[PDB]
Design a protein around this ligand. Structure first.
Ligand SMILES: C=C1/C(=C\C=C2/CCC[C@]3(C)[C@@H]([C@H](C)CCCC(C)(C)O)CC[C@@H]23)C[C@@H](O)C[C@@H]1O
Ligand SMILES: C=C1/C(=C\C=C2/CCC[C@]3(C)[C@@H]([C@H](C)CCCC(C)(C)O)CC[C@@H]23)C[C@@H](O)C[C@@H]1O
Lengths: 10, 240, 240, 10
């Protein structure tokens, strides 16, 4: 689900 | 015969974005798990790559038009090109004198051997070094180096990409900027642009070869455990 | 009035298992991400805990009867008690003089404050220190300390446990060894055993309180990314 | 699925 990626993409 | 007002604005942004996300002192490296010289370098290099991924994300977000994309597309682009952007950006630390990335002292001086102690064979490491040498020999302007990273990132031909129409448009807009900058601001660069595009093709090959070595690492739990959550997620094959 | 030949064999094993998996020099700590003194200590402490989990696994595997359990039960026991075994084993580095775990120099000397910079409030850190002090004050024999860890690990009342009949049997077998060792080999220990059992109850409470603070960490991707794969998996709620 | 745990449990 790319939880970290979503997060880092503000 | 002159760069437009819009073309120079996107350059200013890209060059600033890179300054905000690339440290020439490499002072953050002390915060990574120390290097060790089986697979002793995996922890340090995993931290280095993880750190770099965060940097690449920060840079990407500042690429003109990137934030206007879908969260999905942004992810599809980052997941697919992350390693290529890392390979590009590292050229800035690579040195021809010693054929290695020199980030400070014996500790943070990475030679081809070090990477073999991180799960990669010379079967893949050879082309990467050759790539760095060819890239360094191009003596890119900062403007060009930065433009190249952003064009790589906004490549249309990536697995998972949905709106490959807008992406290609953004990339074309970028290529024009690059071809114009070289023509106008870079003497003897009449052949340069074409050589830079060929490098992108090289990156595809390097990417393919890395993802294969990485697949073996990620499949061996004793090795995968040494990676970071970000690395596992970004280089992982989960589908959004 | 004398320990049996079987009771002393299981002691030899447990004491050796702990020597094989616990370093009094703490020399491996240099390989963790350096400590920093928001949430600056999270990376170091995450590495410390991850390392300790691997050690606890190695110890567990040598506990008489553990390897004879199902992979599932072994996992259910380790996942549920890992943090408790870590809290127990750390008492060996804890010092009453300064009320902190002293693993070497200012760097690896962990005070209550350090842990607050890793996502934990004093609302939980208070009882843990109090626990360490009470545990240290018991001046456990190595045989008892080790027996306590193994009895904690083989606790029947854990979420996910399937064969809670064999587990309890193994644990009872262990408690007998402990109660007999104290009675025979430990003067003035007539009340000791009971106090050690009460400590196990304390651990349940500390466990509960940690898992709540950890849940918040694990839910914040910016923090969870600082954890390790092992920590995420062992403290995660995936069901086998 | 506890891939690392299985692994470490030999
Ligand atoms: C990154 C940067 C740097 C070096 C990159 C390197 C040198 C060491 C070996 C690396 C890291 C290559 C490895 C084959 C990547 C390993 C990937 C993994 C082991 C996780 O599967 C790719 C890029 C190479 C340093 C600095 O230029 C910042 C930049 O940002
Ligand atoms: C472990 C060991 C040691 C210390 C344990 C400590 C001291 C620092 C704070 C710790 C690590 C507590 C933290 C609340 C745990 C944090 C868990 C996390 C931040 C990941 O949610 C639990 C045990 C405590 C050192 C040595 O005795 C080895 C032992 O093995």
């Amino acid at each position: 689900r790319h939880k970290i990626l979503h997060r880092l993409l503000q | 015969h002159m760069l437009s007002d819009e073309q120079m604005q996107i350059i200013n942004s890209l060059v600033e974005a890179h300054h905000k996300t690339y440290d020439d002192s490499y002072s953050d490296f002390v915060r990574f798990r120390p290097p060790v010289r089986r697979l002793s370098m995996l922890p340090h290099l995993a931290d280095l790559v993880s750190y770099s991924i965060q940097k690449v994300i920060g840079f990407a977000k500042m690429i003109p038009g990137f934030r206007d994309l879908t969260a999905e597309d942004q992810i599809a682009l980052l997941k697919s090109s992350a390693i290529e952007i890392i390979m590009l950006r590292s050229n800035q630390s690579f040195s021809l004198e010693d054929m290695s990335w020199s980030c400070g002292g014996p500790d943070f001086k990475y030679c081809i051997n070090d990477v073999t102690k991180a799960g990669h064979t010379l079967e893949h490491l050879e082309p990467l070094v050759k790539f760095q040498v060819g890239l360094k020999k191009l003596k890119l302007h900062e403007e060009e180096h930065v433009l190249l990273m952003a064009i790589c990132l906004l490549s249309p031909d990536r697995p998972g990409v949905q709106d490959h129409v807008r992406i290609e448009a953004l990339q074309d807009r970028l290529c024009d900027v690059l071809q114009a900058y070289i023509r106008i601001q870079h003497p003897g660069g009449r052949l340069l642009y074409a050589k830079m595009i060929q490098k992108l093709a090289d990156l595809r090959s390097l990417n393919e070869e890395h993802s294969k070595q990485y697949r073996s690492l990620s499949f061996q739990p004793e090795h995968s455990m040494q990676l970071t959550p970000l690395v596992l997620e970004v280089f992982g094959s989960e589908v959004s």
